């Protein structure tokens, strides 16, 4: 028995299987930032900090003695609750195949958006810095019309080539930019093919961020340390509802500051 306390919930095995399948299917679609960064294997719930390797000077305990203190990055935990109806839970054993899992889908969407925002733009409250605020290249503004994106992509590629960064290049775009690209010309495919023609990678859709960016997936530039992966826990229940939650714990680090180019939203 662990902290999740799953056995105390009045939920059948088939309902648990269906809920797990739905949650996994939703997370695999709404988890975007995990595909472009290095992800380590889970290390357990006892992980608290990751050493950076740097030190800071200290005054000194006694005369003739000098002291330094190591620097670390902390681990942060996220939890999102939701509620499920007991009638829908019980109908699974009766033979239902269309039970309502919309609150679970919404919770998965929220946790995925939170993780993506934390990775891409940082979490100042927890002391975690993002990739875009630490990027050292010159940001480029996106054009108003969808027909002028390839020249900006080419400018970003030129910046990367001048800086000297190799690897397959991937373009991450926000919802507004993705819709602007898709809803133009003959369905947006000629623009899509132009972008995939300049860059060997694939355009990635990220709903939780604004603007966009271009990065490389050569490896060794972004590290994500995961203590506990996304899991389901049990809080309480009433005569008609059961409250559950999703939880995870991780930390993130961006090593190379010249491997990405920031794309600001159009004016």
């Amino acid at each position: 028995m662990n902290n999740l306390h799953r056995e105390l919930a009045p939920v059948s095995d088939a309902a648990w299987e269906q809920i797990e399948e739905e949650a996994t299917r939703t997370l695999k679609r709404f988890l975007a930032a995990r595909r472009v960064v290095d992800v380590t294997d889970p290390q357990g719930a006892a992980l608290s900090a990751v050493g950076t390797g740097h030190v800071a000077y200290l005054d000194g305990p006694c005369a003739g003695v000098s002291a330094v203190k190591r620097q670390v990055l902390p681990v942060v935990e996220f939890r999102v609750p939701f509620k499920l109806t007991r009638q829908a839970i019980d109908d699974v054993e009766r033979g239902s195949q269309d039970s309502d899992w919309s609150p679970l889908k919404e919770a998965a969407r929220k946790i995925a958006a939170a993780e993506d925002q934390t990775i891409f733009d940082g979490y100042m409250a927890a002391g975690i810095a993002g990739i875009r605020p630490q990027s050292s290249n010159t940001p480029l503004t996106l054009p108003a019309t969808a027909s002028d994106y390839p020249t900006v992509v080419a400018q970003a590629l030129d910046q990367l080539r001048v800086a000297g960064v190799n690897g397959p290049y991937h373009l991450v775009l926000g919802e507004k930019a993705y819709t602007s690209i898709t809803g133009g010309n003959e369905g947006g495919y000629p623009v899509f093919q132009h972008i995939r023609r300049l860059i060997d990678g694939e355009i990635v859709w990220a709903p939780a961020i604004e603007g966009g960016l271009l990065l490389t997936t050569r490896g060794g530039d972004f590290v994500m340390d995961i203590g506990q992966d996304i899991s389901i826990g049990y809080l309480n229940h009433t005569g008609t509802d059961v409250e559950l939650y999703l939880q995870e714990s991780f930390t993130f680090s961006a090593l190379t500051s010249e491997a990405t180019v920031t794309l600001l939203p159009p004016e």
């Binding site: 999740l4 799953r6 988890l31 595909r35 899991s231 389901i232």
Partner: peptide, 10 residues
Amino acid sequence: PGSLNIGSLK
């Protein structure tokens, strides 16, 4: 228990 294995989505 309840891991919900996702890992890397590469």
